[PDB]
Subunit: 284 residues, 4 copies
């Protein structure tokens, strides 16, 4: 399984044609699952889930979608509240691919997209696995913006290799995961004018007319499906105190916290993450 063998494109309508890149694997399997990556500079489906896709493709039909603004999906300069926009894109892709009800797996911004989609198209969303998700999280103790969010912002406004590497280092517990290669590739993707325009448009979509769409901690008491919250104890971007309202108000919630783990849960606890996900989503 490679970036190229799994690579696919689809065009959907969100206020016009919109091209979504995604990765597909496990086409023989009967349960489809959708993976949604996080929102940091240079984030994409393959770079964020590359290894998880191989493992999960043994049990499920995996669709790992590059969210609008990211990877090889379109990077419009104008859109509404990012999660609402990304959820409409995904709904376009569900209709095109003929999907019914599908479980969703989302990290950070992708978690928020998964929840916005689950609230807006309740019949189409199955079980949710959310790794340090944005939107449903509300930092009851941490001053906002957090250190990790400030380092994300600083890169958007001063896109240097040094700012990118500062962000990558607060994303993980074990800083030896941040190789000079991984910084080289993320910087190259992240610092293109189109990726920098997309990040600014994403970051400033939260303060707009439909800003309440991002405040999903107000809404998640409406979810009826089982939801697995997964947190790295040492997450500096979306810290653990952000889990509490979702854990309290989602009727069929569970929470798994990993010690010695940051924001990149699916990489830093690769084996334990994949086993939780396969078991919670049934087993394919």
């Amino acid at each position: 399984l490679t970036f190229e063998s799994t690579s696919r494109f689809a065009e959907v309508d969100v206020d016009g044609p919109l091209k979504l890149h995604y990765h597909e694997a496990g086409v023989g399997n009967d349960q489809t699952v959708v993976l949604l990556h996080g929102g940091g500079p240079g984030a994409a489906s393959w770079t964020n889930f590359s290894r998880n896709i191989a493992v999960l493709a043994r049990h499920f039909h995996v669709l790992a979608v590059d969210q609008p603004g990211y990877g090889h999906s379109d990077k419009r300069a104008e859109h509404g509240q990012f999660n609402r926009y990304a959820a409409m894109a995904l709904k376009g892709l569900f209709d095109q691919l003929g999907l019914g009800r599908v479980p969703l797996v989302g990290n950070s911004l992708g978690g928020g997209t998964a929840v916005r989609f689950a609230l807006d198209y309740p019949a189409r969303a199955g079980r949710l696995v959310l790794m340090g998700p944005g939107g449903l999280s509300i930092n009851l103790f941490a001053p906002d913006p957090t250190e990790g969010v400030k380092r994300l912002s600083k890169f958007s406004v001063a896109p240097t290799r040094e700012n990118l590497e500062a962000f990558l280092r607060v994303m993980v517990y074990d800083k030896n995961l941040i190789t000079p290669e991984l910084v080289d590739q993320r910087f190259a993707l992240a610092s293109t004018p189109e990726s920098l325009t997309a990040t600014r448009a994403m970051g400033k979509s939260f303060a707009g007319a439909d800003f309440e769409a991002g405040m999903m901690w107000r809404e998640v008491y409406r979810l009826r499906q089982p939801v697995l919250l997964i947190w790295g104890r040492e997450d500096r971007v979306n810290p653990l105190d952000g889990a509490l309202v979702a854990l309290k108000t989602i009727p069929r919630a569970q929470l798994h916290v990993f010690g010695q783990c940051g924001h990149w849960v699916q990489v830093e606890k690769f084996d334990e993450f994949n086993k939780l996900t396969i078991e919670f989503l049934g087993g394919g």
Copy 2:
């Protein structure tokens, strides 16, 4: 300054005439403040604030209002979401007394009413002092219903002196405050058939069409005034974990927690509560 010398009635309009009983003192002072008691069986303005009224009336024009369902105020068999209903009553009283923008002090249910008023009539509410408020509180750790709320429900089903005294015991840290006289004064009001009709009417109001009006932890981010949250560390009705969302999301929040203090803060910590409130509200 007695029950009799301070007693007042007003007839206000809430889908028809509604008699409110209240207590008024410090008519000599130019700064008005409204006190709103909690929703415990047999609660009323004088039994819950009698001694606070005397101290506060040195500095302020004090209106302590028996909420609908309580004391000598009308006890309708049917109404909407209680806080919405009680806030509309209060709005009626404000127009009749020609009050402009007035600070509000409120314990538990009357704290929820204060907030519902401050949200629904934003120009009419000043600084808020809220002691273990209901509605804007959401217990992130405490399983609902709490031990305190189960005792409130039990009295509603089996209205005996014993069930009233079990409720009063979990309302306070120092159980010696629960005198046979206080029990006799609460049980006299609590056990009238009008009072018992008002309690069921209230329970029904939280499950009805406008039930979201009760979930003010989703809305307090909209409050523009200074808000003093006051908690007893040992509150068994609305425990301390219920303060966190309001403290995070109210821009001009402050929190004061008293150790060795339960749900009846204005009495358990009389002198400290009176001094905090006088200072926070600007001293007269």
Copy 3:
């Protein structure tokens, strides 16, 4: 597998001969695990883990020990801090059975025993699975004693069927688990003079010369092994706020919270509990 086929006895020295009852199964397997039940009236190894033992005996050599004061183990009227006493008993049993390093699974009082044993004999304790454990838990929000602890206490002082059934009902989320049969058997065991003497001696062992042995939230930063904290979101005896210091200070900690689950985690989430335990403890 039955109460009788698995039943075993061993005599150990703790300030004199002490008889411990325990249940043994999976003698063919190579990994031993020790199960330690909770401290509520009538609690025992078979009644608390009966079904889990069958499942876990497929992968491990299960030793489910009746803690001193419980089941068919001795019920002395005098001992030191209960967890220290129970940990010395278990150390006696490890030596007698020729065990080396063994993982431990403990609910509530048994969790505290497992931790006290892991701190006092560090080489003998493997991975720990702790379900709403006592001792390492400190209720940062919940007033102590909790509702569930009060109902435990009330039974010890007024051992009626009605008090026992009140305790059993706050131990679980789904109150239909508390059958008239389960109340009949627990009451019969719990209300014997020897079981009532043991419970009082356990309950009053926490306020004695070695009281600091019970305050294990001060010590768990010394644990070096992986530890799985498991909590029912709706636990009313040892609520979730008690997890936070252990989750923070144990280096290799994880936390799994189950929504719609009380204190009897291993029964109320039988399948999800057994799968977490088998996976965390390796797989046998």
Copy 4:
């Protein structure tokens, strides 16, 4: 009331002579209070409390003490656990001035020193006011080291004006308080070779034999006096989650949180902090 008019030295014994510099005012008043500043680079009694000293000296006999390692106090290259060391210095000063039992006000590091003193010399410490205290704080949600503490460490390694100004920025909510004058006054003290030797000596002291002396969240259950914990809601050094164990386990705790306030509470919320402190300490 100036730096010069209030300046004092005492030579005390801590394994040998130790010069402490302090500021004294309100020699007219019979109730003494000691103020202990935080451990930020270039912190001292006058830069951290100058204006508080003037207000407090209307009511109290104020001693504001430059802790060892700071201001004009001795800056030894080696010492034990800092708080233990600083508390022994303070004990020396108490005996020389013939102080009996005196209340203590302390921010961050000086809050830890206040508590270490109150534990180690229980008869000599009165009421404690503690603003974002270190040592008794343990961050149940915030990954350690916090953003604030990493900036303190970074200055220690690369002592530039820029690194000092980055530290000051995360110390306060209103960044306009960080004037070029304050930066110049802190950077003057911070960048001396004695000061930079005192910072490393301090870091080494937290990893040494008596490192537990620093973990006072394990010991504050022993405090018998009233304790006012004061927190800025936006403290990025010692965040609000660090208050919870101390608030739970100090019998006579109170907590006051200010919204729109960081780590420098005595200045960010000058008038409210001065009024709380004067009232809590008994008004003179």
